[PDB]
Design a protein around this nucleic acid. Structure first.
Ligand SMILES: [Mg+2]
Lengths: 55, 145, 73, 127, 57, 104, 73, 143
RNA sequence: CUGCACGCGCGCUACACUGACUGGCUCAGCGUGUGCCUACCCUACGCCGGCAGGCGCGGGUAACCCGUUGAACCCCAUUCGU
């Protein structure tokens, strides 16, 4: 409570503020091209993005 | 064009308390003064207008007199001030480049002051540990036995 | 001035691993250079016998009507 | 008369207290100067205000009461030279006396975070 | 407003396409859903649901 | 009005933009305009790489995803009332066309 | 082996200027072990023998300086 | 014959031009010339004394090839190999404040001039005299 | 989580003269770059400083600007000599 200081530690620069896009991790994420997904999350939709492999 | 040798060649010199070798040349024999390094040497000699190829036992003791005198206090012969060692010294406020056991005087006086008011830096000097924030779990085992 | 014998020139390339080098040999009078500078004026200095080598083993005489100049990238 | 041998940067403490904030960076070293270049925030005012409360209500020839604080980012400033601070370590409030020496350090240097090593003999490990 | 790069446009609709495919799977699970097909236009864009049992939507 | 227009086209897939290339080629040249050809700007391949495993156990494998985007580009000259029949002679979900502004 | 004969004595300077141009191959790596000198004064003394015209210059390289005798016949 | 600078052995062409500026002492040497250290990846002062004349000679040749090189471009072209010691080496950009004061040094002699966008070219004064001495060192090379 | 009487595992430098310095001199490719939310991007140029850097002024959402990516090793000239 007492909103003077509740979320006061500045969520800005730094990986405690960057998060996973899919369901809210903050570890191993991919900020490349502005995708914002953690490494585990990215593989499932892999094709769903469009990143096909060599084949 | 030093062809044979002169009749005088100082085998070893004697500058403040360290008998510097006469065998080495000028810029790399006065590095052996504990306080004058390899880069501070070249500033002094190029202020001194000496031969930077001659060797140490090959000049008169008026020539060595001019070299020591320039490095004795460097501020007053057009030498800049983020070049010296004791820049803005924390007991006097002065700028100096120190050459001798006085450098070792000002060395340990830094350490005991960190020990006397008990800063965290000095306890690591009172102990045999690494001071500048490294690990010690896996490195420097033969500090102790 | 394009009067006497224009456009008797071919442009021929050779490649090793990244280095494309294409010479525009004209008809002329024995003038060989690379990027402006000549072929005795080159930087590795131990390989003088391996870049004016086609002038060496074939000869200066047979190729004295040609004006080879080279660009390198 | 009533004298001891001392000198700090050609500037004795008898002219340190009557000296502005902005020219204390002319004395202080580089990292302390960047801190004073930037904003001493409100919790840094709040400690020195209680210190200004502590010096004035001092009994004679006597320490102020110790002040428990939790920051350990503060430059040791001349406005509380000679005061009794209490600085947090991880577990306790270590009781520290300020003095003329250390003006150029912080308040984490005087309340150690770890307790130093003592001993050691190999048990299961060190094969 | 200001406009971003092509390398972040193609991932932006690549990641747009995945998200509604996730939710419509979560929404139309019971129907024989089977995917999407999207057409982006500078007009009314046209999403289509390939549901087998088309009544239940 | 009279203009100077540039139409762009790019996609993930190549075979679809090969046809959209030639279709606007014939779609100006059936109305006998003047075209400069499909300029071959190089292909942009981005090769994001992940460690393929959810945990730390394995024998240190890696996978290399990549997406090659192809892009081609064509000028014309014609007035921009017919930007609609430049737009609406192909629908094609997987292509992204742009037309540069026609102030010449 | 430790820093011997810096700045020549007379006892061996004659031993230089009697027979050091007689040698087939003359090189600072050769006189550095024949005499007792620690280098770098050969290279001053060898260049002045070149400055007179005793030895003739062959190699001229930034770490390998090689000369020879006077061509007798 | 009609001879340029490109067909001249340029590792000693610079030695000719630095001897030219040494006898023609109209170039301005800055006062900090032996407290300089020259692009901090290196760890001694130079063994030469009039290195500013031979640094001016080298920045003349590099600018003759590429017209339109700024001061940061002049740091790019001398930059070398920084040895960190216990850490692996890297590339180091050159020295700005001695490349700027050497372009201001050629500014005083009027061998250099400023360009339309960013950059610097050389005046027709600057290319008339070094091509003159480029053949002069090439005809002395032959002799 | 970095605490050090100690043990072990990937890895970086060196033990030189086939090199270390100093100064010349030179030739690459892959690729990334200002954000719906998220506010911090690559930077050329110019003028200040021995150096990190500071200042205004401009491009770049990109085969457009950085960028003919003047990379290193190496080449060569001096100094250094077991
Ligand atoms: Mg050895």
């Amino acid at each position: 409570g007492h909103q003077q200081l509740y979320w006061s530690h500045p969520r800005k620069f730094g990986q405690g503020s960057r998060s996973c896009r899919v369901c809210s991790n903050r570890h191993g994420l991919i900020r490349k091209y502005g995708l914002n997904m953690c490494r585990q999350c990215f593989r499932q939709y892999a094709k769903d993005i469009g990143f096909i492999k060599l084949d | 064009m030093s062809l044979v040798i002169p009749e005088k060649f100082q085998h070893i010199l004697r500058v403040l308390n360290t008998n510097i070798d006469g065998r080495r040349k000028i810029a790399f024999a006065i590095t052996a003064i504990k306080g004058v390094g390899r880069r501070y040497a070249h500033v002094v000699l190029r202020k001194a207008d000496i031969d930077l190829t001659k060797r140490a036992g090959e000049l008169t003791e008026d020539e060595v007199e001019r070299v020591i005198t320039i490095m004795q206090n460097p501020r007053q012969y057009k030498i800049p001030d983020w070049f010296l060692n004791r820049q803005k010294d924390v007991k006097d406020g002065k700028y100096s480049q120190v050459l001798a056991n006085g450098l070792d005087n000002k060395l340990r006086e830094d350490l005991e002051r960190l020990k006397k008011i008990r800063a965290h830096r000095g306890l690591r000097h009172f102990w045999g540990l690494r001071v500048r924030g490294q690990h010690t779990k896996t490195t420097g085992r033969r500090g102790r036995t | 001035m394009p009067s006497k014998g224009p456009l008797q020139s071919v442009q021929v390339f050779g490649r090793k691993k990244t280095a494309t080098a294409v010479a525009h040999c004209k008809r002329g009078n024995g003038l060989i250079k690379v990027n402006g500078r000549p072929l005795e004026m080159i930087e590795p200095r131990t390989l003088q016998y391996k870049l004016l080598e086609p002038v060496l083993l074939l000869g200066k005489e047979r190729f004295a009507g040609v004006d080879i100049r080279v660009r390198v990238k | 008369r009533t004298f001891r041998k001392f000198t700090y940067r050609g500037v004795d403490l008898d002219q340190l207290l009557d000296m502005s904030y902005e020219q204390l960076m002319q004395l202080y070293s580089a990292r302390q100067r960047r801190r004073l270049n930037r904003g001493l925030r409100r919790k840094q005012h709040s400690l020195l205000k209680r210190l200004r409360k502590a010096k004035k209500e001092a009994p004679p020839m006597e320490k102020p009461e110790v002040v428990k604080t939790h920051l350990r980012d503060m430059i040791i400033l001349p406005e509380m030279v000679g005061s009794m601070v209490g600085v947090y370590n991880g577990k306790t409030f270590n009781q520290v006396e300020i003095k003329p020496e250390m003006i150029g350090h912080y308040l984490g240097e005087f309340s150690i975070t770890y307790k130093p090593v003592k001993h050691g003999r190999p048990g299961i490990g060190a094969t | 407003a200001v406009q971003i790069s092509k390398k972040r446009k193609f991932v932006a609709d690549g990641i747009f396409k995945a998200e509604l495919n996730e939710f419509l799977t979560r929404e139309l699970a019971e129907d024989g859903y089977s995917g999407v097909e999207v057409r982006v236009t500078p007009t009314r864009t046209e999403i289509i649901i390939l549901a087998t049992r088309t009544q239940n939507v | 009005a009279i203009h100077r227009i540039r139409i762009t086209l790019t996609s993930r897939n190549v075979k679809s933009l090969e046809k959209v290339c030639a279709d606007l080629i014939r779609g100006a040249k059936e109305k006998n305009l003047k075209v400069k050809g499909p300029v071959r700007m190089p292909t942009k391949t981005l090769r994001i790489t992940t460690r393929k495993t959810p945990c730390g156990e394995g024998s240190k494998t890696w996978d290399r995803f990549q997406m090659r985007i192809h892009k081609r580009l064509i000028d014309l000259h014609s007035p921009s009332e017919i930007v609609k029949q430049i737009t609406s002679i192909s629908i094609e979900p997987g292509v992204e066309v742009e037309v540069t502004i026609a102030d010449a | 082996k430790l820093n011997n004969l810096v700045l020549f004595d007379k006892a061996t300077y004659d031993k230089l200027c009697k027979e050091v141009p007689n040698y087939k191959l003359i090189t600072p790596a050769v006189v550095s072990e024949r005499l007792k000198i620690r280098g770098s004064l050969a290279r001053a003394a060898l260049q002045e023998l070149l400055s007179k015209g005793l030895i003739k210059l062959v190699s001229k390289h930034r770490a390998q300086v090689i000369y020879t005798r006077n061509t007798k016949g | 014959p009609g001879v340029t600078v490109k067909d001249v052995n340029q590792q000693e062409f610079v030695r000719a031009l630095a001897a030219f500026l040494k006898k023609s002492g109209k170039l301005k040497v800055p006062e900090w010339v032996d407290t300089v250290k020259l692009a901090k990846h290196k760890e001694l002062a130079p063994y030469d004394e009039n290195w500013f004349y031979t640094r001016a000679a080298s920045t003349a040749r590099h600018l003759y090839l590429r017209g339109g090189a700024g001061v940061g471009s002049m740091t790019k072209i001398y930059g070398g190999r920084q040895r960190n010691g216990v850490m692996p080496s890297h590339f180091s950009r050159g020295s700005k404040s001695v490349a700027r004061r050497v372009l201001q040094a050629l500014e005083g002699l009027k061998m250099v001039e400023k360009d339309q966008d960013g950059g610097r070219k050389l005046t027709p004064q600057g290319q008339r005299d070094l091509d003159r001495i480029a053949g002069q060192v090439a005809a002395a090379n032959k002799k």
